[PDB]
């Protein structure tokens, strides 16, 4: 076959069309170069790019066989020479996630308009979830040196339209994510353990105020840790198990971890909280790595200090790096999820840094932000669909 021909079938989806078309093409000298077919909402698009004998292409017979077969059953078909035509479309450079509850038309309109303004072509759109939130994906092709401007434009859109918008590299390498770390407090676990410990001392007031002050980045994490843990001076150490037994996982956490195990992720937690609370939990969740701070105890009583070294903002990044080196995972294939300014160095070190219901100081430097109280929306950012989760879980 020395000449190329493109055949394009469109119309209301009926069964047997695919087989019929290729059964027809076999009565001509036809060899396949590319086939693309989808049905969206009962609309068939079937594009077939072939090579065929020069004398077959230059003859009405091939045309008449195809047009007869396809038009008969009710669909449309076009046939034309190619030769210059690209055989197989190029990969998308990036992918974009839009999560909302709801996603207004105006919101998605604003996204699609920012995309267009920056010469960014949309290659594919699909739904990735219908619960817990609506999730849409756009695989896009970004002009080189425009993706900074894109994330920026789309962040403005995200704030103004009340949806999450994440732009991610869609390269083979950068999208084989293999390792994830969570912060514990207000990320993997509901609320602040240190405030739960403080309530036992009748100090939740003092400590909640300082914690919000520290997670918004207004305070040095270490001095803030020292001032907060000091309020616990004199509590019996038995208070650690009490609080540990009062911890509720973030909605979607179990689903998030279970799905990450299916995908063969290394899973870890990096916290500024307390090891006696977190290790007992990390064992339960079957995690691969823990790093936390440690409460000082004397005669079964908390002294109000921690036992150095303190895991600070920098320490969190150092622990991610440590975890990644041990697991044999390059930094670009690592994921970090946090909610506080505590986590800023960690997120920026990771391949993908995800801010989860986060303070402004973190959202501003995070690769991606989530504003809904479901930790499994993290999974959508990692290329997983709700359907795929539900399917896999039903196999038990």
From the list Mg ion, a second copy, none, partner contacted by residue 183 (C-beta under 5 to 8 A by kind) = Mg ion
Out of 137, 161, 183, 195, which residue is the one contacting Mg ion (CB under 5 A)? 183
Contact status, residue 150 vs residue 108, Cβ threshold 8 Å: no
Least distance to a second copy, CB of residue 133, Å: 11
| 168 touching Mg ion, by CB under 5 A | no
Least distance to a second copy, CB of residue 214, Å: 35
Instruction: Determine the size of the site formed for Mg ion (CB under 5 A).
Output: 5
Q: Cα(266)–Cα(274) distance, rounded to whole angstroms? A: 22
Least distance to Mg ion, CB of residue 166, Å: 20
Radius of gyration of the chain (CA): 27
CB of 59 or CB of 91, closer to a second copy:
91
Pairing of strands 266-274, 289-293: parallel
| 186 touching Mg ion, by CB under 5 A | yes
Q: Cα(198)–Cα(60) distance, rounded to whole angstroms? A: 85
Q: Map the footprint of Mg ion across residues 313-342, applying CB under 5 A.
A: 339-340
From the list Mg ion, a second copy, none, partner contacted by residue 22 (C-beta under 5 to 8 A by kind) = a second copy
CB of 24 or CB of 219, closer to a second copy:
24
Residues 6+ apart with CB under 8 A from 212: none
CB of 82 or CB of 206, closer to a second copy:
82
Ranges assigned E (strand) in 156-283:
164-169, 179-182, 266-274
CB of 30 or CB of 189, closer to a second copy:
30
Q: Is the dihedral of CA 122, 125, 129, 134 positive or negative?
A: positive
**DSSP 3-state of 313:** helix
Least distance to a second copy, CB of residue 152, Å: 19
DSSP for 192-223 reads -HHHHHHHTTT-HHHHHHHHHHHHTTSS-HHH
Q: Cα(137)–Cα(103) distance, rounded to whole angstroms? A: 12
Q: Map the footprint of Mg ion across residues 337-376, applying CB under 5 A.
A: 339-340
Binding site for Mg ion (CB under 5 A): 183, 185-186, 339-340
């Amino acid at each position: 076959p020395k000449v190329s021909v493109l055949i394009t079938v469109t119309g209301v989806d009926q069964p047997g069309v695919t087989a019929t078309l290729f059964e027809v093409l076999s009565r001509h000298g036809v060899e396949l170069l590319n086939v693309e077919q989808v049905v969206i909402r009962h609309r068939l698009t079937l594009g077939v790019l072939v090579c065929c004998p020069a004398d077959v292409a230059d003859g009405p017979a091939l045309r008449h066989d195809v047009e007869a077969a396809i038009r008969k059953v009710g669909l449309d078909v076009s046939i034309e020479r190619s030769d210059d035509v690209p055989i197989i479309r190029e990969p998308s450079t990036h992918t974009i996630f839009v999560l909302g509850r709801p996603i207004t038309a105006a919101a998605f309109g604003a996204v699609a308009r920012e995309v267009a303004a920056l010469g960014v072509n949309i290659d594919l759109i699909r739904g990735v979830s219908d619960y817990p939130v609506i999730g849409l994906e756009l695989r896009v092709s970004v002009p080189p040196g425009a993706d900074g401007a894109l994330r920026t434009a789309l962040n403005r859109v995200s704030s103004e339209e009340h949806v999450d918008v994440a732009v991610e590299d869609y390269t083979l390498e950068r999208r084989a994510k293999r390792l994830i770390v969570f912060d514990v407090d207000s990320t993997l676990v509901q609320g602040e353990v240190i405030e739960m410990l403080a309530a036992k001392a009748g100090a939740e007031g003092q400590v909640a105020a300082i914690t919000d002050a520290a997670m918004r980045g207004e305070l040095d994490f270490a001095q803030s840790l020292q001032q907060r843990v000091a309020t616990l001076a004199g509590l019996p150490a038995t208070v650690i198990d009490e609080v540990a037994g009062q911890l509720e996982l973030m909605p979607g956490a179990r689903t998030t971890l279970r799905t990450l195990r299916r995908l063969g992720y290394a899973c870890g937690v990096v916290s500024g909280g307390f090891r006696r609370i977190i290790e007992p939990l990390a064992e339960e969740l079957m995690l691969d790595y823990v790093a936390a701070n440690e409460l000082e105890i004397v005669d079964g009583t908390l002294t109000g200090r921690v036992v150095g070294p303190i895991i600070d903002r920098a320490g969190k990044a150092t622990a991610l790096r440590e975890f990644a080196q041990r697991a044999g995972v390059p930094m670009a294939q690592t994921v970090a999820v946090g909610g506080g300014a505590n986590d800023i160095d960690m997120l920026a070190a990771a391949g993908l840094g995800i801010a989860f219901n986060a303070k402004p100081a973190l959202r501003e430097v995070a690769d991606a932000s989530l504003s809904h109280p479901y930790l499994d929306t993290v999974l959508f950012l990692l290329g997983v669909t709700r359907g795929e989760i539900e399917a896999a879980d039903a196999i038990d």
